[PDB]
Design a protein around this ligand. Structure first.
Ligand code: COA
Ligand code: COA
Ligand code: CL
Ligand code: MG
Ligand code: MG
Ligand code: MG
Lengths: 150, 151
């Protein structure tokens, strides 16, 4: 356990960001994925409203998550939106996912955020079991609609 | 009322209309004990390059609106848009305002070259589901939403 480190990426961590994206690509089984150019990814990493957390063994990325800050108009305290979370399939069920969620909520707690939220597909049984083990404050059944643009 | 209804995307000198919309949200969502954040905060939010508000106007009266957040992607150079809140004044519902707000919002992000816009509704909110389904979305997915209320 001493071996696992959690790191919040900084603006000079593009190589680690790209490792994480490649982990996403593999774990989510994305086919024919063409990674965006590094200038785009750098600009994203530079944003003050986006935070990436990774899990490291040595400097091998074995999991991570991405999150977005949503400034509120209902409150001065912001919300954080955990977008993606994944752990290397060889390293799953070792407490890594849990440590990532803990660190993430700890970070936004110290930043004085109101809440953090995250979502899973109703079909995704393994994800559901995971989030339900993280002592979330609550869960809600929602319907997600999207419009694919021209 | 189509001839008189106007959709406006708020700009940075539109804080009065932003506040009017928040007051509409408070009414429509029937929020209790709401203390609106100070104007310095709301102004800073309005000034962000990742936040866009559309309002529906009957003359100078806000009768609906929606807020949306930009989410730049790492899977694509094309960003996503997240519609967070949408409401129409109760006196003016079921007259096509909600549809015109969605339409305007998707047209805008289409001009901006976004990949996709998404919006959510609670599964028990049958009337909201009815509404979104009438706007002809590309697809809908069942999702479970978890949150962590921070200390
Ligand atoms: C939908 C809403 C957001 C604004 O949209 P609107 O102006 O009322 O809706 P529109 O007039 O543009 O048209 C949508 C119609 O809603 C649906 N609808 C019609 N009557 C309805 C009713 N009594 N209840 C629910 N949906 C109804 C129709 O399916 C649809 O048009 P259709 O005739 O083609 O089937 C509004 O009703 C509202 O603010 N409700 C309370 C707040 C809310 O739920 N917001 C969304 C979640 S944040
Ligand atoms: C969940 C995930 C994201 C990372 O989690 P992880 O490091 O493997 O999970 P943890 O080891 O921290 O598990 C914590 C708890 O999840 C729960 N859990 C139950 N079933 C599980 C399963 N099939 N997989 C993972 N966690 C499970 C356990 O209670 C577990 O505690 P325990 O081992 O003491 O019983 C990882 O499984 C994953 O990447 N899955 C594929 C991608 C994905 O679905 N991501 C979420 C959607 S974006
Ligand atoms: Cl690479
Ligand atoms: Mg670093
Ligand atoms: Mg367990
Ligand atoms: Mg204006």
């Amino acid at each position: 356990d001493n071996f696992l480190k959690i790191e919040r990426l900084a603006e000079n961590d593009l190589p680690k960001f790209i490792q994480l994206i490649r982990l996403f690509e593999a774990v989510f089984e994305m086919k024919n994925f063409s990674i965006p150019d590094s200038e785009h990814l750098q600009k994203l990493l530079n944003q003050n409203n986006f935070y990436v957390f990774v899990a490291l063994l040595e400097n091998k990325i074995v999991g991570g998550l991405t999150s977005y800050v949503l400034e509120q108009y209902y409150s001065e305290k912001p919300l954080a939106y955990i977008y993606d979370l994944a752990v290397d399939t060889n390293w799953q069920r070792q407490g890594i996912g849990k440590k990532l969620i803990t660190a993430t909520n700890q970070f936004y707690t110290e930043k004085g955020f109101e809440e953090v939220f995250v979502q899973a597909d109703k079909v995704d049984d393994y994800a559901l079991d995971f989030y339900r083990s993280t002592k979330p404050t609550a869960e809600e059944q929602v319907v997600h609609f999207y419009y694919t643009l021209k």
